Amino acid sequence: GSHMEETRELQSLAAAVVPSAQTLKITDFSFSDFELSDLETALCTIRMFTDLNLVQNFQMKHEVLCRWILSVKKNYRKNVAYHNWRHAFNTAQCMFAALKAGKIQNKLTDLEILALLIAALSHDLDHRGVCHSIMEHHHFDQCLMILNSPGNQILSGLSIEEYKTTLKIIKQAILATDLALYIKRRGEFFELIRKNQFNLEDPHQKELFLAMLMTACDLSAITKPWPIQQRIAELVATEFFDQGDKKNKIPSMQVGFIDAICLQLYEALTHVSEDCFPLLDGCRKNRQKWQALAEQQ
Numbered sequence: 001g002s003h004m005e006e007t008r009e010l011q012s013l014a015a016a017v018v019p020s021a022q023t024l025k026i027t028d029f030s031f032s033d034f035e036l037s038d039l040e041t042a043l044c045t046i047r048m049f050t051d052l053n054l055v056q057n058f059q060m061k062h063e064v065l066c067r068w069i070l071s072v073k074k075n076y077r078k079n080v081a082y083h084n085w086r087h088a089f090n091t092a093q094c095m096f097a098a099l100k101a102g103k104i105q106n107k108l109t110d111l112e113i114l115a116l117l118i119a120a121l122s123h124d125l126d127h128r129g130v131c132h133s134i135m136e137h138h139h140f141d142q143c144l145m146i147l148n149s150p151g152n153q154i155l156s157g158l159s160i161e162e163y164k165t166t167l168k169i170i171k172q173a174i175l176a177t178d179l180a181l182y183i184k185r186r187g188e189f190f191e192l193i194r195k196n197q198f199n200l201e202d203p204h205q206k207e208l209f210l211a212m213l214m215t216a217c218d219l220s221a222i223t224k225p226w227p228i229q230q231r232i233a234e235l236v237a238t239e240f241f242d243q244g245d246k247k248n249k250i251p252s253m254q255v256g257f258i259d260a261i262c263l264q265l266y267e268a269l270t271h272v273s274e275d276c277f278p279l280l281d282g283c284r285k286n287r288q289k290w291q292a293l294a295e296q297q
């Protein structure tokens with residue numbers, strides 16, 4: 001958009017009243033953004049930061065937060081069917097739901113939460129594309145550029161060390177969305193859980209969990225109510241077909257993706273917190289739906 005248009009958008013956002021988390025429904029794991037305008041996703045984002053006490057705990061100026069959110073949004077690579085602002089926004093919303101409804105908040109520090117939210121919203125910036133097609137390598141560089149860009153520095157209130165720590169976690173969180181990295185480190189996570197040895201007090205295990213949580217939120221579309229999951233799966237297919245430039249196999253592949261990548265993760269997450277069960281439940285239900293189709297409806 002033009003300079004004038006971007007200015008009007010910022011004006012509208014900054015002056016808008018931010019509805020409660022309840023009104024926005026961002027606490028629900030089944031949340032959908034289909035009917036929301038970009039402005040509304042921005043208000044939802046502000047609410048996430050607010051109810052997670054980030055605005056307060058880190059002294060974020062309203063205007064700066066609004067500007068940073070809009071700067072992240074407008075900077076998403078255009079013409080990408082799935083990995084775009086909406087997916088990033090949804091990843092952040094799932095993170096918020098997991099921290100609140102999933103009750104994972106009290107297990108993390110304010111800096112880890114700060115970093116996780118920022119990474120969720122920024123992880124698909126500078127999307128380049130590429131089975132092995134779902135093995136994308138993410139890029140945290142643009143995330144940091146925007147975070148450090150004049151007028152958008154929402155971490156300005158952090159001490160030198162808090163800032164250095166936050167950036168380290170942000171980098172780890174973004175890289176964690178690389179499925180190759182998830183596949184590489186998940187074995188350790190699953191075994192710790194299986195042997196009742198999972199310990200969040202252990203720095204290494206805390207870091208491992210944060211990476212697994214990023215993956216869970218990044219793939220959460222697979223847990224949504226059927227009609228919603230069906231539409232987002234179309235977006236996924238469209239993105240791959242756009243790179244290509246078939247469909248009768250989608251059902252079988254969805255089941256394969258769920259069985260090989262998703263289910264065990266949501267099952268494990270449920271062990272860390274039973275309240276995250278909905279994600280597992282939604283995933284199981286979508287597997288059944290896809291299996292029915294695969295066996296030929």
Ligand SMILES: CCCc1nc(C)c2c(=O)nc(-c3cc(S(=O)(=O)N4CCN(CC)CC4)ccc3OCC)[nH]n12
Binds near residue numbers: 219221233252253257
């Ligand atoms: C964006 C890529 C990651 C991702 N996120 C979501 C929500 C999805 C999703 O719903 N579906 C896919 C998704 C995953 C695969 S796959 O590469 O894993 N495929 C199935 C498994 N077999 C091995 C047994 C290899 C080939 C294939 C197609 C997919 O989307 C089809 C619409 N990927 N995906």
